[PDB]
UniProtKB/Swiss-Prot annotation, chain A:
Assembly and binders: Component of the Mcm2-7 complex. The complex forms a toroidal hexameric ring with the proposed subunit order Mcm2-Mcm6-Mcm4-Mcm7-Mcm3-Mcm5.
Protein family (similarity comment): Belongs to the MCM family.
Annotated localization: Nucleus; Cytoplasm, Cytosol
Superkingdom per UniProt: Eukaryota
Function: Acts as a component of the Mcm2-7 complex (Mcm complex) which is the putative replicative helicase essential for 'once per cell cycle' DNA replication initiation and elongation in eukaryotic cells. Core component of CDC45-MCM-GINS (CMG) helicase, the molecular machine that unwinds template DNA during replication, and around which the replisome is built.
Residues of the full protein shown: 124 to 245 of 733
Signal peptide: none
Name this polypeptide is given: DNA replication licensing factor Mcm5
From Swiss-Prot, chain B:
Motif, Arginine finger: chain positions: 20-23
Self-association and partners: Component of the Mcm2-7 complex. The complex forms a toroidal hexameric ring with the proposed subunit order Mcm2-Mcm6-Mcm4-Mcm7-Mcm3-Mcm5.
Function, as annotated: Acts as a component of the Mcm2-7 complex (Mcm complex) which is the putative replicative helicase essential for 'once per cell cycle' DNA replication initiation and elongation in eukaryotic cells. Core component of CDC45-MCM-GINS (CMG) helicase, the molecular machine that unwinds template DNA during replication, and around which the replisome is built.
Species of provenance: Drosophila melanogaster (Fruit fly)
Family the entry assigns: Belongs to the MCM family.
Entry protein name: DNA replication licensing factor Mcm5
From Swiss-Prot, chain C:
Protein name, per record: Probable DNA replication complex GINS protein PSF2
GO cellular component term of the entry, any: CMG complex
Cystine pairs: none
Keywords: DNA replication, Nucleus
Record-linked InterPro entries: GINS_A, GINS_bundle-like_dom_sf, GINS_Psf2, PSF2_N
Nucleus as UniProt keyword: yes
Assembly and binders: Component of the GINS complex which is a heterotetramer of Sld5, Psf1, Psf2 and Psf3.
GO process annotations (BP): chromosome condensation; DNA replication initiation; DNA strand elongation involved in DNA replication; double-strand break repair via break-induced replication; regulation of DNA-templated transcription elongation
Gene assigned in the entry: Psf2
Amino acid sequence: SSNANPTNIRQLKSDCVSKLVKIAGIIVAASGISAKATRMSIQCLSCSTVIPNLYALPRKCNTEQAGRPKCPLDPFFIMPDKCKCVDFQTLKLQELPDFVPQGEIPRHLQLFCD
Amino acid sequence: GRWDDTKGEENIDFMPTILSRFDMIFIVKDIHDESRDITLAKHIINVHLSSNKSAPSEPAEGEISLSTFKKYIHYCRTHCGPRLSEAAGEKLKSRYVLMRSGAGQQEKASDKRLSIPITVRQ
Amino acid sequence: MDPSIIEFIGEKCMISIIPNFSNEPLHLIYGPVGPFRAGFPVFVPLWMATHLRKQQKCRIVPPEWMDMDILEEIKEEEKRSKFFTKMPCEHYMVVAQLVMSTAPDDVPRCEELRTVIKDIFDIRESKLRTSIDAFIKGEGTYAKLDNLTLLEIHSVRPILPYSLDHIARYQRTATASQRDTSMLS
Amino acid sequence: LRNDFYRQLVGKRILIVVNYDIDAICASRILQALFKYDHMLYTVVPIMGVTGLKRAYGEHQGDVKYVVLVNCGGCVDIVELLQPSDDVTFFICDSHRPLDVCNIYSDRQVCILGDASLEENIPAFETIFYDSEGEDEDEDESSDTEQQHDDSGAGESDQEDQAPRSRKLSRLERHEQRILKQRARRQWESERDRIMFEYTQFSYYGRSAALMVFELAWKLSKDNMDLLWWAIVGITEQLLLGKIESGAYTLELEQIQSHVSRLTNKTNDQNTMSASKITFENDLHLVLYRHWPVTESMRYSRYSSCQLKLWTLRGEKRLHELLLEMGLPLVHARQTYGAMDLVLRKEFFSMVERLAEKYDIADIVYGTFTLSYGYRSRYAAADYVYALLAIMESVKKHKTPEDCFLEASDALSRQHKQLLSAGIDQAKLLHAAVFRQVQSSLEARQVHSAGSFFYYVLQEEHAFFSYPYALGLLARFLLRGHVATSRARQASDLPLIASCPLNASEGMCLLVGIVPVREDSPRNFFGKAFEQAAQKSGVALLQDFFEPAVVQLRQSDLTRFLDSLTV
């Protein structure tokens, strides 16, 4: 939190990206409550699959202890006994009633939560 | 306008079934009076002058902060679930009785229906 | 149970300090007081260095448990202290507050120090929640004090017991009353 | 001195701290501290005026012998003011210095801290009260008055050749038996040339109210950092050498730093949270570098503005051009200085000090102090005082004057700060409401010269300008305002007046006097100057303040009084 200053949607631009900010708008509607999680295991390797980003799933089998008769070509059995669960809601945002709606209409933006 | 309001039944243009659903129903006239005229005159000009009342506005009594009213309302509705006392019921009942009797008498004091429907809704 | 009632208990304790007078406009009290000479230590209670340091009269030094290594080893002993740990003066939670108000004008390292006292306080308290997490069958003849200190226990005192009477009345009635086959109240 | 007289101070007392001032509170809270230290109970007081003072003493009709007032005294031969004073100990410590001599003399009930490089008024009593002409304190040739009265043997005594003293010349007659009166008036009037030089032409202020008090309590071994800051507040009020003079600035750079720097109680272990001993730095009287963006606070001060003329557009153009050379971004010029990024907000003053040398401003930087309580934020040198003046909040509750005083004195603690930000906010909104009138009045051409001065009058009441501090501030922003750009170089030097409506008080048309430009040491005529018309016609005037430069009239009894007061 802070008390720095609110900005306006008309300036949320390529420079203002990956970057912390402050605004003030108004709300319209937003989604239901779906799902998301962080990691999980797979029977093929039996390791909780650790990720930086919140997908590539490489080639080799890891049920290779079958002799020479191995299982290539991505055999991944996702084990959601072993997965996680966080929230996800997709909040929304309309712009102000005084900040370039004048000779125009107001745009808006969609959002995210965990 | 007020022509309908001077003489009788041109009140609504559409229907009496939405004359039904509402309780307190208000004429708006602008009947003349020069005292009223001048007082309206300066009253709004003293408003309408230089974005006038910043300092000497809130110095009135306690008439303040619609913000407070947002909070006050969202409180007071969210708790209390009242209902009547016994002594209120009989007089209100008899009052509605006399209301419908007077409406019906104006029906009879003109020999024709002169009333609003005395509803259970009232 | 209060913030000061225990200073009628705790603040009467003593250290020994240095004044800048010798014996004053009065010499000395008929009492356990020592003779007053500047430039040398003197033993006093700690309801007065308060009065004196801020009266701009003296310096002061702490006890020795007010240190680092004692307060770096007491904690790790206290970790697996399934019951309790080392107790340097047993109400150091009140001495240290009335110490660290003013004296940190010249006390050394008055911050990492505070860090540890908080670090030990919280843990010992939290332990004193989980003792409750085994209390079954009315065990009001079995408890722990063995190296307890007092500034932690008064934070519980009025809560449980004014309940625990009618709580375990159902079973304290058992070794105090009689009925037919079922349990009594 | 009172390393001896302070040892008198144990019995009962009354500590009065005369009408609102920042010298007052800073000088007095320290002494409240001092006096609950040696176990004395005492009395602090709000002062609403000289009548408030006189009723106050009236309510304290005891024999409290150690009476104390501070930052006042030049009103009367105050034994005439305060008759029942018999040998009662008073203490004066005022910097309103042009004070009476009967208060100085009569070494009974007063404290002559007479210490000054001006030995100019020594016989100032030796002829006005000591001589007289056409007098009754005398004898007659008849035998009914055959008693010797208070024979000064001077003009105070008879003028009929009965004066045993006055042994400079002949006795019976110089040219006549009553040439006594002739020479009496010769000296009387030829040196009223210098008496009327005192008190009837000009007034000023002198020295501190409470830096002497710091040295007093310094001799008792107190290193109270906060007391340095409070006295700093007391001085930085009228450090404003344009408002009322400091002078010693480049000498107090030795004095106070020497008080505080040389005695370093911790030279190696001070990197701590609470009250890490005060520092000193060279910074501005730009209003409020810290908690606001540039571009509003670059705009409400007079000195930054008047030299670059921003209440018209073109000033903003050159402004932007100097932000250009500075290369500040406009967004950054509209986020709080602290709310800026780092490197700019570090190097800001670092660059501004040297490349404002070249573009019309020279006199913005000062020498002052600042410090932390803790980790919240780093408060500023004067942002207390400009929060204080905003606490003179004359609301219609009737308690708020004295209550706001009591609040203010309860502010400069390290404790009460939720209100201090309040004071900042209140200050800012008033500060740009100042500007809000200047454009209206300049370009409406309300600058009434009306002869030998400039003159303003206003029409209704603002809560800003109910009280007169804001009024002097109005007058002292417009003045530079107008006289920059509407004049040739001839007439930039004339004084200024300003009406001040009080719709509250039934119609009185308050006024404040204020002076022409750029003469720091050559100060007010208006120690008395208004009183001329008071003599000539004279209508319901007041001089209630120990502040001189002020009056209070009727709503409408001024204009003819002004026409008399033309000269």
